[PDB]
Amino acid sequence: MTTNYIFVTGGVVSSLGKGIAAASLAAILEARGLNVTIMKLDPYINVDPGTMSPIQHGEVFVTEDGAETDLDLGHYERFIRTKMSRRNNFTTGRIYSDVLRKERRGDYLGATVQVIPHITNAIKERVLEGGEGHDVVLVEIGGTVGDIESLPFLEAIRQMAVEIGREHTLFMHLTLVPYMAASGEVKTKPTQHSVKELLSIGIQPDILICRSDRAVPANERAKIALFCNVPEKAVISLKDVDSIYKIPGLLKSQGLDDYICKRFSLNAPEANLSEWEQVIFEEANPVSEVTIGMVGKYIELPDAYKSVIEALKHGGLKNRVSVNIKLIDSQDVETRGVEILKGLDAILVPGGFGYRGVEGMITTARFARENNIPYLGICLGMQVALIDYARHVANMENANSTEFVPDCKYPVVALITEWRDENGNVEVTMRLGAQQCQLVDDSLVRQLYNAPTIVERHRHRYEVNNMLLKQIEDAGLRVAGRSGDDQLVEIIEVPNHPWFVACQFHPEFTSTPRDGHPLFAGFVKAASEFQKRQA
Amino acid sequence: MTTNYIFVTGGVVSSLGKGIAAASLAAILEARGLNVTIMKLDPYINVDPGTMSPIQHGEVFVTEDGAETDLDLGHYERFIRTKMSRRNNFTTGRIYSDVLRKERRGDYLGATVQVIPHITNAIKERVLEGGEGHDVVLVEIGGTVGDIESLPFLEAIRQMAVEIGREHTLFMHLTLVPYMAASGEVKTKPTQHSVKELLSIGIQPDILICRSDRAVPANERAKIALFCNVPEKAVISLKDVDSIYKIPGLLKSQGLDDYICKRFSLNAPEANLSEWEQVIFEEANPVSEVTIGMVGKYIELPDAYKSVIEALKHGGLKNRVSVNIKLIDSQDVETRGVEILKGLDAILVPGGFGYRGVEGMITTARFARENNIPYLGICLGMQVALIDYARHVANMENANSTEFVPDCKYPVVALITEWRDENGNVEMRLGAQQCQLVDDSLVRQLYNAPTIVERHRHRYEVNNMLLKQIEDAGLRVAGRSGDDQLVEIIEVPNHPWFVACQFHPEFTSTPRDGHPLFAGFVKAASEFQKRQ
Amino acid sequence: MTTNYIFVTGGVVSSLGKGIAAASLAAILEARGLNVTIMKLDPYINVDPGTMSPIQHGEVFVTEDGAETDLDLGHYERFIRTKMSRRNNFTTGRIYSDVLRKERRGDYLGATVQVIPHITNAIKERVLEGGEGHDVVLVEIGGTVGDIESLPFLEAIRQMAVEIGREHTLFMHLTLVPYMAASGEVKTKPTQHSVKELLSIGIQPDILICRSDRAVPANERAKIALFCNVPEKAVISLKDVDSIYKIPGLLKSQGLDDYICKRFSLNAPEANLSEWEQVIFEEANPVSEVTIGMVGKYIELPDAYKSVIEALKHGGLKNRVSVNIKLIDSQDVETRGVEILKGLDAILVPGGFGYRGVEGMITTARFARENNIPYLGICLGMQVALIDYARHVANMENANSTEFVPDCKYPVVALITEWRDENGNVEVTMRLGAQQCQLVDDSLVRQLYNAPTIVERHRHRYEVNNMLLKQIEDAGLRVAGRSGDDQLVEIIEVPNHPWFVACQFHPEFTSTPRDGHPLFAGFVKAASEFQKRQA
Numbered sequence A, C: 001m002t003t004n005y006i007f008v009t010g011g012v013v014s015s016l017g018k019g020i021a022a023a024s025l026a027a028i029l030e031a032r033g034l035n036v037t038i039m040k041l042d043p044y045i046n047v048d049p050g051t052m053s054p055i056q057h058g059e060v061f062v063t064e065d066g067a068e069t070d071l072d073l074g075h076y077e078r079f080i081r082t083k084m085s086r087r088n089n090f091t092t093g094r095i096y097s098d099v100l101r102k103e104r105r106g107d108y109l110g111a112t113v114q115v116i117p118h119i120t121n122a123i124k125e126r127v128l129e130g131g132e133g134h135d136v137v138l139v140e141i142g143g144t145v146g147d148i149e150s151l152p153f154l155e156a157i158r159q160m161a162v163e164i165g166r167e168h169t170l171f172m173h174l175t176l177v178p179y180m181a182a183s184g185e186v187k188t189k190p191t192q193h194s195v196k197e198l199l200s201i202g203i204q205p206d207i208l209i210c211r212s213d214r215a216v217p218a219n220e221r222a223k224i225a226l227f228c229n230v231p232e233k234a235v236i237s238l239k240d241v242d243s244i245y246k247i248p249g250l251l252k253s254q255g256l257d258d259y260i261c262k263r264f265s266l267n268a269p270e271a272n273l274s275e276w277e278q279v280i281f282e283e284a285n286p287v288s289e290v291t292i293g294m295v296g297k298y299i300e301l302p303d304a305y306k307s308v309i310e311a312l313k314h315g316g317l318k319n320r321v322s323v324n325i326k327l328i329d330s331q332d333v334e335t336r337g338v339e340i341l342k343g344l345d346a347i348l349v350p351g352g353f354g355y356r357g358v359e360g361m362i363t364t365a366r367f368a369r370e371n372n373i374p375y376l377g378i379c380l381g382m383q384v385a386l387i388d389y390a391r392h393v394a395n396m397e398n399a400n401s402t403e404f405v406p407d408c409k410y411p412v413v414a415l416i417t418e419w420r421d422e423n424g425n426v427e428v429t430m431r432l433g434a435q436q437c438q439l440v441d442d443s444l445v446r447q448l449y450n451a452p453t454i455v456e457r458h459r460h461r462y463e464v465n466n467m468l469l470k471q472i473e474d475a476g477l478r479v480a481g482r483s484g485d486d487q488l489v490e491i492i493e494v495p496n497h498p499w500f501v502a503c504q505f506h507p508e509f510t511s512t513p514r515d516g517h518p519l520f521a522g523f524v525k526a527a528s529e530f531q532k533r534q535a
Numbered sequence B: 001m002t003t004n005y006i007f008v009t010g011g012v013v014s015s016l017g018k019g020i021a022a023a024s025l026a027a028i029l030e031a032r033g034l035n036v037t038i039m040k041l042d043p044y045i046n047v048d049p050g051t052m053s054p055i056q057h058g059e060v061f062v063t064e065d066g067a068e069t070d071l072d073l074g075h076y077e078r079f080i081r082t083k084m085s086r087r088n089n090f091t092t093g094r095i096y097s098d099v100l101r102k103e104r105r106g107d108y109l110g111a112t113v114q115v116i117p118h119i120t121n122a123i124k125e126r127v128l129e130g131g132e133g134h135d136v137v138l139v140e141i142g143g144t145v146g147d148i149e150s151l152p153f154l155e156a157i158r159q160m161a162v163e164i165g166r167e168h169t170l171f172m173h174l175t176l177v178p179y180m181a182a183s184g185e186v187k188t189k190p191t192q193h194s195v196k197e198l199l200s201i202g203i204q205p206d207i208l209i210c211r212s213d214r215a216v217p218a219n220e221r222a223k224i225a226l227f228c229n230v231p232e233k234a235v236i237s238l239k240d241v242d243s244i245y246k247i248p249g250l251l252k253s254q255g256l257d258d259y260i261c262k263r264f265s266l267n268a269p270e271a272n273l274s275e276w277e278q279v280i281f282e283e284a285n286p287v288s289e290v291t292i293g294m295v296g297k298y299i300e301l302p303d304a305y306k307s308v309i310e311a312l313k314h315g316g317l318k319n320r321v322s323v324n325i326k327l328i329d330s331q332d333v334e335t336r337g338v339e340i341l342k343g344l345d346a347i348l349v350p351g352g353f354g355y356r357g358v359e360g361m362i363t364t365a366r367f368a369r370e371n372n373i374p375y376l377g378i379c380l381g382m383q384v385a386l387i388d389y390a391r392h393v394a395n396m397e398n399a400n401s402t403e404f405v406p407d408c409k410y411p412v413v414a415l416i417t418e419w420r421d422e423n424g425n426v427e428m429r430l431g432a433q434q435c436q437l438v439d440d441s442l443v444r445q446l447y448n449a450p451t452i453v454e455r456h457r458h459r460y461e462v463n464n465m466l467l468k469q470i471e472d473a474g475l476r477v478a479g480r481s482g483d484d485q486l487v488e489i490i491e492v493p494n495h496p497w498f499v500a501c502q503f504h505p506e507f508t509s510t511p512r513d514g515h516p517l518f519a520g521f522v523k524a525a526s527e528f529q530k531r532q
Ligand SMILES: Nc1ccn([C@@H]2O[C@H](COP(=O)(O)OP(=O)(O)OP(=O)(O)O)[C@@H](O)[C@H]2O)c(=O)n1
Pocket: A186, A187, A188, A189, A190, A220, A223, B013, B014, B144, B146, B147, B148, B149, B150
């Protein structure tokens, strides 16, 4: 079976929903039994998003194999059951960095190294490596048709299409169709002009996905076809919907996947969207409501927490509980006190870097342990909770993480090789990716995950200081999971509490709307339980 | 006194507000004491909008000199006091038409006649004609930058800018900066792309006017400036507003007029927007409310009645009355009956052509003459009033206009050449025309003068031979022309407020100066509303 | 005094003569007493041309400070008396390589690193560093307006222009105006369309330089002005000329520099072109003719030898001798024998890498030493001559350079740390840039350069093997110059010959048409002397 490529580009503006549109299309194809994958090409110069603040392009997502990648890969894994790896995300930086290393070491045998063919060859090679043995590969191109930064990407895929042939390649282009109040109509002009820009780069789109805040009527769809050399049936409307889970069914109901299977000549059964319809049904029919406070330092751009917010939403689905997520600046806790935590059925403290806003989290971890409000702490949020417990229950004054005050008396969280005592004695490298974790026989989480061993994903360097550990266990705190070797602590529980769990790994990256996640489902159940005993 | 041009263009999408934007800008400049004018270049092929359906590009506006032009000229006249004439509007059709004629007749001396320089030359000459003897001329280019249709307009102005010089020309380019809900941001990408299209046609914009449904924040303005080679102070924000009357003010508060005066080297006092401030204040503080029904055949596209809608709103201002205009399909008076006129404090029947829906208008004029509801009838509306009368009070069975049923026994409205009687016995107006007011009419009063000037666009007149008969049965002749004493205004004098006229009074109404008929009409509608 | 920038771009095609057009313009400005410089921006990905074969974009030029750069810098140094350094040439590779190194080490503080502003900032910074304290800086942009590879360059300079203002920036754009035989006219259409491409990138050219194979008449110049928003007087004609030395006077005679000085507001005296007129006069009035054979492995692209060919031409000027340069494949010597060297008044063997064609050079060095035909050997050509002498006069059979047969018995040329005996005994890193060299008291070259110490430029790694040196001196060969320390051999002479010199340094990079070069002038004199005793 020959591999087919659908290239996804966007025009007019960015924030158009390319990731989500691609992922949804992939979900449909998946449900026709096709073997599908997706990859993201980002135009940034960063070698990988590992050096990007979460308020730049949102969360740094992590795949099983430890790659730091764009958050689109989160969308991909939540719409299809394929696992993303390093192979599904690369940037312009990564391309240039490979080519420079090869040029400097003489691999090009004295040739002038050029954007074409050398940069573009490099791009084609990773596109082929990401597609390897899949029937259909959606290749999402970042940036907007017309700007400078994504031109080599577009020229690469142009070349591929000619090389591979139109029998096995399609171009899917998203554009904006804005509504004008004065005239009461949506406008095709930007689509017309975007398609001319795309053509001027040498690409004829085959399918047009029309983004608007309402459906694009037949009249205007026909106008777009007329001007873009695309048949009417390949001009698809994609309105703003109240739930992303509806997107696959919306695209299916307009023939998009039929049109694709015909072009690629695949006999495949009609997409069965039962799992989506189920998720949609669940979402539409909550039995009760909770309010969960997410308390962290990046709430000014919520995408910093994209996968967490979705995991919560999946926790809602598994409990038929509608989760109202209220974002709370953890630094306002420092200023305005515990006051602003009033009125919450649970509390989540997410991950982060840098001292700013961390003392507000420690406080937040406290308030939730003392008032018996259920608490989930992820990475940093597990670290600030160890810190809370030590300071306030094992009475280790001023305890902290070497990340924030390097020279503190009780460094409860520190790099493995910074580990020391309160006396100064010692014993005689980012953790990335999927790692096995042993669950402790009598813990909440051993029951929730219901297995002695689980696999979750890491992105952190600061560990639980084993040298100060016994002193904290002795004061009540329980260790609920450890790694495979060198027993580092992965999970802690405060057992005098309805529901208080915190973990080092990012469980949100393995949560999905179809299959949920045992930790979040638990966390949300507890929030509902707690909500109902206050009423 | 060198003449300065400001070329106004539009990018991304149309329906951007170029007309109003340009008109507002003009309003500010006039308020600084400058001699100013505006003109519209339409890319369409119609020689003029005279053959255009009112549901196509809206109403056909008529200027003092009797030209039929785009409705944008209405906006112009409602923002500045300079009078538009036929030189303030021309189409691509008009341009090719003149060049073709000159060519078939040999004026090109056997040259190959080309888009450049012959079509572009013809465009340049007309832009110069519309501009002559003005300080600042706003030239509004129809269509959207990027499209085929307006390229010759764009190349002609590019040439003009280079000929006349950068010290006397400015390019103002409007764009759309849409809001994305996903990100909570307005987006400058389309502006950056549109300025590129404009540059590729050889035009560097000087001023960017950013349309959006909310203000464009300083960050986005700064990014537009960085990418488009314009300084930040020349990136202006023009959000959707709740009242066009606030647009002169909104632009002036961002320094637009200063920027222009600086570039064109003019010392002019600061703009005095007091009349606009007054207009905004009136509109913001109505004391009563009314519902007025507009009954006619083009309600599917409200711009068909653009100047009438506005003249009512100006009637509102002058009485501090807020007017709700209920657009009513007069075809529905035919199907569903007089019920659909339930709940109106006044009824206006506007102009039109074609029989479809006119029987509904006659039922409508009756309803109002009968149930003592105030009525204003413009052109068709005045004609269908006479039909109602003769037909229901002078008992002239099935009376009509020859435009609709040519061989009717009683042609009360008919071309002047068609003028007959009930036995068969015997014996198109455009522009500003003098009208004489009858000494004892509700209208000699409202206009507070003997003779007036109003604008015509119609063929069919009141039949003078059937006239003395309808006068006897009650009806009153309130105004008449110069010669042939044709009937211009009729009143039913046993009604609180019933006026109807042949001319289009809406074309002279402005928000600053109001209009005596619509002031009158709206005042009456208020008085009626109080009595229920 | 404020720095002014003239940006030079090209359109329609490449090979348009941007380097030469810029350099000539610089020469005019120089002659108005202005302090001028020039820089080249290349769109290649190579970090620097050090890894490019000479048949890629021609010779790798070397500046005093040792930078490996584009051959345009040769043109610059031959038209103005400023010295080029690393500062005057950078590539896209160099830009990306700096930015990647800074991004990976966290210098961007978590920002997304983008083509704009990060790549473009980097470019602006080197443009400012190259311009530092000069009155006028010509900034030559490589590639052709309209292609992908030079877009960031164009966007950078666009930004600069707005920032610095039009008071101190001009855009000079070259285009092609082709002659059509069918119609008998030159065509302005490509200029029209190129200027629209340049505008679409956001740059309004200020000056148009019209390349054609004949002058561009007034009619068409006016047409170009009409369509490009440029005044007639800024549309300059630049026909194919028989001598580049005429280009400054051609541009001057059309007001180009007047137009520039007016725009930048400089009072400067009229350009005095006396030195050029002199060079032109010299060139036009040769007294006799010679034929010099250039024998090397890259003659398929003569630009591989750009500066050598020009040095010869300057040697012609200093002797009023018209040099007919005949290029000869040194590999055809291997095949067709010494035969193809018949009919030559001198012989030059240039530099190179790799064994292919080197045995033909050794042979060539031989033929010239035996028949007393004057010989100049540069770098490789000095190495193959040591090799010739050893094999055939010091009778060291099969002698060679470790570069070619690493394990040979007599490695006469080898890396310093490969140095060994014919017995295998030993004693108890490219050379780049301007280095001092001591001249030997009784040598030809000590007289020609007329000083005990000279400065010439290196680009080589293989040295004269000091361990086998005494054995070659003993057989006749004389050392004519050495370095400063560690006495490595820079120059050799065979003293039983009318004129036989060879050197390690590249003397062609310090030769110019105005001031000539003592070695080449000598070499050409000798060729003329030799030509005249055969007649
Ligand atoms: N490449 C094109 C496409 C359309 N037009 C012109 O576009 C005008 C219509 O303008 P507008 O409504 O702004 O364009 P639409 O195509 O209707 O797009 P939208 O849906 O945005 O209105 C027509 O007169 C037609 O001649 C043009 O000149 N060149």
